[PDB]
């Protein structure tokens, strides 16, 4: 009996839910998803009920989504209400801080200015901006209204207590809580900025587009960005205080029935959604306003599995709300420890050594996969890591920015010398001949890991263009592509032990460039790797028993034109050019990371002669720990600070051409917040 127990917060809701239940029954087959209405006293009660497995779903505003996520409720966003249109649905709105043109102050310059808020306890109007400013407020920070009244020189804070904190009503005396106050609400605040009452208005992105009579004249205003610059009003996606989801249905994280819920809601919108039926409207009711869903809902979208409450609300929102709930401020004032994210134990061990040697300027966090780590960087849990260009692509879509680049070219100009990137090559045994780029079908393949430039993106994208279909495990007989689904044929050649098999970290010995080459040696027909890999691993350069006796002349590269050439010929035989691996971070950590890493590499960088008695940041044993082992230095990006600018137009098109084949969960989640 597959039944979604929906939680109602009022009798009016309860009766709407029952109408919902009865109408679904007339549409869904008996055997399928049905509604059960369970009534509770309040949203908290509902959240607890869902956690207690006494009920299944409820729809929350943003703040409650956060509450729902905390222990011991541990609930997650599953379905999203969207607004305004099917082709361009608004799941989210953006809280922005809007100011006048050329008024010359940034977000960290706000102390002393005059503020306009939509009203107290509103999200964009109050909670977000005050939350992000919380540490800038003078102590005591309790009670909040008093602190805020001391931060700004004067305000309009509708609904604020003006009796106790006069300056909060200064721009709208009385602090009126209704539209009777010309400064109340969204338009109210904007009109307060326009009137020249305040210096800044805290509103959402749609506010100025809606409230300007002339509609050009937006060029008279800008937005404050968290990095302390200003962008034009149209740039709000890139300049905003927080991105918040409007109305979100949540369920248990484990055993939450997310499938059932999405099946139910999807069928419901089909029959009862906007304009769909005269018999029942999911999105209105006679009984009241906004029952079970907002009346302005146009439909539902499924929230991607990878998402969790922190990731869905976003870094900035969570920062603001945590500041408000917890209330902990740091006591100072220069660069804090950079938290580096390590891949499993291998990377964690070296990262610890790095931290001890940097005397605390570096700290360590582990995750079992690159995607996991990237998400921690999004969180705040971690600060930075270095990434294969395929992952600087994903991190980019996830909002992270590139800061320094790995340089593999040897010179005394290194940090100041941009590189064009290395080469993705297809490597085969000289002994096996007549196997060509023209048909590799049915042969056995070795990849660095799924989603990586040479090992995956370049060769598979090309193959995709040839074969025009996504299943490469059907194309190759077998292979090792770490990060593949474990029951795939692309996990079969992997050397990983037990559950380690095909894991995309160093627990799998076929993981990474060297890992892949060892796979070609020991199992496969063709390995996808960087052009440097065969010379690095032959001629005794690699001491380990497997590669100890390997000779370079025993391998050849597959040329696109259907021919083969010796591995030195890689300039004229290659699959494509790969952008150098780069370090990525959050925009807010980007200055600190750039400065700390430059110091750190001057200390531990390839200038370090003896790598035994001392720590060498750029070396490990064949494993590329924390950085490629061939990294000469970390180089200045300059204008190239966005993933798109950094990778180049050509690579970003190639990876995008592969979008239909993507197994990436994190990419799915990210492109959902920001297409």
Partner 1 sequence: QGGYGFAMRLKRRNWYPGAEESEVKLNESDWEATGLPTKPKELPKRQKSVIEKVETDGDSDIYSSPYLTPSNHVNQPKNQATGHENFQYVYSGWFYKHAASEKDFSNKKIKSGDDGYIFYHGEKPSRQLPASGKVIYKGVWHFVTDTKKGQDFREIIQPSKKQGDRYSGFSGDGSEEYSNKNESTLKDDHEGYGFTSNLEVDFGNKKLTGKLIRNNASLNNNTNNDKHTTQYYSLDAQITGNRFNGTATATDKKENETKLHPFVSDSSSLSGGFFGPQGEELGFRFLSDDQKVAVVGSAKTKDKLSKLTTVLDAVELTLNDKKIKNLDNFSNAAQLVVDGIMIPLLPKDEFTRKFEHTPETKTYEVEVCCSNLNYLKYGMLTRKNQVEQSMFLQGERTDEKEIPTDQNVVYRGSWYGHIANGTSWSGNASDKEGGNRAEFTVNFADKKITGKLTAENRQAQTFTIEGMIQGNGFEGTAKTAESGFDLDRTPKAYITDAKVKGGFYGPKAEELGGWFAYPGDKASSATVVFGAKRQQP
Q: What are the residues binding Fe ion (CB under 5 A)?
A: 388, 453
Nearer to partner 1, 353 or 668 (CB): 353
Whether 658 contacts 459, CB under 8 Å: no
Q: Which is nearer to Fe ion, 323 or 386 (CB)?
A: 386
Could you tell me if 565 and 559 are in contact, meaning their C-beta atoms sit under 8 angstroms apart?
A: yes
3-state secondary structure 604-642: HCCCCCCCCCCCCCCCCCCCCCCCCCCCCEEEECHHHCC
> Known binder of ligand: residue 581?
yes
Interface with partner 1, residue 29, by CB under 8 A? no
Binding partner of residue 388 among Fe ion, partner 1, none, CB under 5 to 8 Å per kind? Fe ion
Q: How far is the CB of 498 from partner 1 (least distance, A)?
A: 4
3-state secondary structure of 252: strand
Enter the DSSP assignment of 541: S
| Residue with the shortest CB distance to Fe ion | 388
Among positions 563-622, residues that touch partner 1 (CB under 8 A) are 612, 615, 620-622
The string of DSSP letters for 339-360 reads EEEEEHHHHHHHHHHHHHHTTT
Is 469 annotated to bind a ligand? Reply is no
Q: Which one of the spans 156-164, 179-187, 467-475, 494-502 is the region binding partner 1 (CB under 8 A)?
A: 494-502
Annotated binding residue 57: no
Residue 310 as a binder of partner 1 (CB under 8 A): the answer is no
Q: How far is the CB of 593 from partner 1 (least distance, A)?
A: 22
353 binds, among Fe ion, partner 1, none (CB under 5 to 8 A by kind): partner 1
39 versus 348: smaller Cβ distance to partner 1? 348
Distance in angstroms (rounded) separating the CA atoms of residues 398 and 6: 32
State the nearest-atom distance from the C-beta of 422 to Fe ion, in Å: 7
CB of 508 vs partner 1, minimal distance in Å: 10
Q: Measured from the CB atom, is 242 or 449 closer to partner 1?
A: 449
Closest CB 429 distance from partner 1, rounded Å: 9
Instruction: Please report how close the Cβ of residue 509 comes to Fe ion at its closest, in angstroms.
Output: 18
- 477 near partner 1, rule: CB under 8 A: no
Beta-strand relationship, 576-578 and 200-204: unpaired
Cα Rg, the chain, nearest whole Å: 28
Query: Which one, of 475, 508, 506, lies nearest residue 491 by Cα?
Result: 508
d(CA 372, CA 343): 9
3-state secondary structure (DSSP) of residue 447: strand
Instruction: Give CA–CA dist 175/156, Å, rounded.
Output: 7
Q: Does 495 bind partner 1 (CB under 8 A)?
A: yes
> 449 a known binding residue?
no
Q: Pick one of 619, 623, 628, 640: the residue that binds partner 1 (CB under 8 A).
A: 623
For residue 561, the surrounding DSSP H or E stretch is none
Task: Encode 399-436: b = buried (16+ Cβ within 10 Å), e = exposed.
Answer: bbbbbbbbbbbeeeebbeeeeebbbbbbbbbeeeeebe
602 is in an annotated binding site: no
Query: CA separation (Å) from 208 to 99, 100, 271, 316?
Result: 11, 12, 36, 22
Q: DSSP labels for 508-533?
A: STT-HHHHHHHHHHHT-SEEEEETTH
How far apart are CB 271 and partner 1 at their closest, in Å?
46
C-alpha dihedral over 69, 73, 74, 75, to 10 degrees? -70
Residue 612 binds which of partner 1, Fe ion, none (CB < 5-8 A, kind-dependent): partner 1
366 binds partner 1 (CB under 8 A): yes
The number of residues that bind partner 1 (CB under 8 A) is 33
- State yes or no: residue 507 binds partner 1 (CB under 8 A): yes
268 among the known binding-site residues? no
CA distances to 118, 252, 632 from 103, rounded to whole Å, are 21, 48, 45
Annotated binding site for hydrogencarbonate: 118, 122, 124-125, 448, 452, 454-455
- Which residues here bind partner 1, judged by CB under 8 A? 345-346, 348-349, 352-353, 356-357, 364, 366, 495, 497-501, 506-507, 509, 521-523, 543-546, 612, 615, 620-623, 625
Q: Which residues are annotated binding-site positions for Fe(3+)? A: 61, 93, 186, 247, 388, 422, 513, 581
Summarize the annotated binding site as residue ranges. 61, 93, 118, 122, 124-125, 186, 247, 388, 422, 448, 452, 454-455, 513, 581
């Amino acid at each position: 009996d597959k039944t979604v127990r929906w939680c109602a917060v009022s009798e009016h809701e309860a009766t709407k839910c029952q109408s919902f239940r009865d109408h679904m029954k007339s549409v869904i087959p008996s055997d399928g998803p049905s509604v059960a209405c369970v009534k509770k006293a309040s949203y908290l009660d509902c959240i607890r009920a869902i956690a207690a497995n006494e009920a299944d779903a409820v729809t929350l505003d943003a703040g409650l989504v956060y509450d729902a996520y905390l222990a011991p409720n541990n609930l997650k966003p599953v379905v999203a209400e969207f607004y305004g249109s099917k082709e361009d649905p608004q799941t989210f709105y953006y809280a922005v801080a809007v100011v006048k043109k050329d008024s010359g102050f940034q977000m960290n310059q706000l102390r002393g200015k005059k503020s306009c808020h939509t009203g107290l306890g509103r999200s964009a109007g109050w909670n977000i901006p005050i939350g992000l400013l919380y540490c800038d407020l003078p102590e005591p920070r309790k009670p909040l209204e008093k602190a805020v009244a001391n931060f700004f020189s004067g305000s309009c804070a509708p609904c604020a207590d003006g009796t106790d904190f006069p300056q909060l009503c200064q721009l709208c005396p009385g602090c009126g809580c209704s539209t009777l106050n010309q400064y109340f609400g969204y338009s109210g605040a904007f009109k307060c900025l326009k009137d020249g009452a305040g210096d800044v208005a805290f509103v959402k992105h749609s506010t100025i587009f809606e409230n300007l009579a002339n509609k050009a004249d937006r060029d008279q205003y800008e937005l404050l960005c968290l990095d302390n610059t200003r962008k034009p009003v149209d740039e709000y996606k890139d300049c905003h205080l927080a991105q918040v989801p409007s109305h979100t249905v949540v369920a248990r994280s484990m055993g939450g029935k997310e499938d059932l819920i999405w099946e139910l809601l999807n069928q419901a919108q089909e029959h009862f959604g906007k304009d769909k039926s005269k018999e029942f409207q999911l999105f209105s009711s006679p009984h009241g306003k906004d029952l079970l869903f907002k009346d302005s809902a146009h439909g539902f979208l499924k929230v991607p599995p990878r998402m969790d409450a922190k990731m869905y609300l976003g870094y900035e929102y969570v920062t603001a709300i945590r500041n408000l709930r917890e209330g902990t401020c740091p006591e100072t004032d220069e660069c804090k420890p950079v938290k580096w994210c390590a891949l499993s134990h291998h990377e964690r061990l070296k990262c610890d050594e790095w931290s001890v040697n940097s005397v605390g300027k570096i700290e360590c966090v582990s995750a079992e996969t690159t995607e996991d780590c990237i998400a921690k960087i999004m969180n705040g849990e971690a600060d930075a890591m270095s990434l294969d260009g395929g992952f600087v692509y994903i991190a980019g879509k996830c909002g992270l920015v590139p800061v320094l680049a790995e340089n593999y070219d040897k010179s005394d100009n290194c940090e100041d010398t941009p590189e064009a990137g290395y080469f993705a090559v297809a490597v085969v045994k000289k002994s096996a001949s007549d196997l060509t780029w023209d048909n590799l079908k049915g042969k056995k393949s070795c990849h660095t890991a799924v989603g990586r430039t040479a090992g995956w993106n370049i060769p598979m994208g090309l193959l995709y263009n040839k074969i025009n279909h996504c299943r490469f495990d059907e194309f190759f007989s077998e292979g090792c592509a770490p990060g593949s689904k474990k029951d795939s044929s692309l996990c079969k050649l992997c050397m990983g032990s037990g559950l380690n098999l095909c894991e995309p970290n160093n627990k799998e010995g076929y993981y990474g460039y060297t890992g892949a080459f060892r796979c070609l040696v020991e199992k496969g027909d063709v390995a996808f790797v960087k052009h440097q890999t065969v010379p690095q691993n032959t001629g005794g350069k690699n001491p380990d028993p497997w590669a100890k006796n390997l000779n370079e002349k025993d391998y050849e590269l597959l040329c696109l034109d259907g021919t083969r050439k010796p591995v030195e010929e890689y300039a004229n035989c290659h699959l494509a050019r790969a952008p150098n691996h780069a370090v990525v971070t959050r925009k807010d950590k980007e200055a600190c990371v750039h400065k700390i890493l430059r110091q750190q590499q001057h200390l531990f960088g390839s200038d370090v002669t003896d790598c035994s008695g001392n720590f060498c940041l750029f070396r490990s044993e064949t494993k590329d720990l924390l950085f490629r082992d061939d990294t000469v230095c970390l180089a200045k990006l300059h204008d190239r600070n966005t993933y798109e600018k950094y990778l180049g137009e050509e690579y970003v098109k190639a990876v995008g051409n592969l979008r239909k084949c993507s197994t990436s969960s994190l990419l799915e989640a990210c492109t959902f917040r920001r297409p």
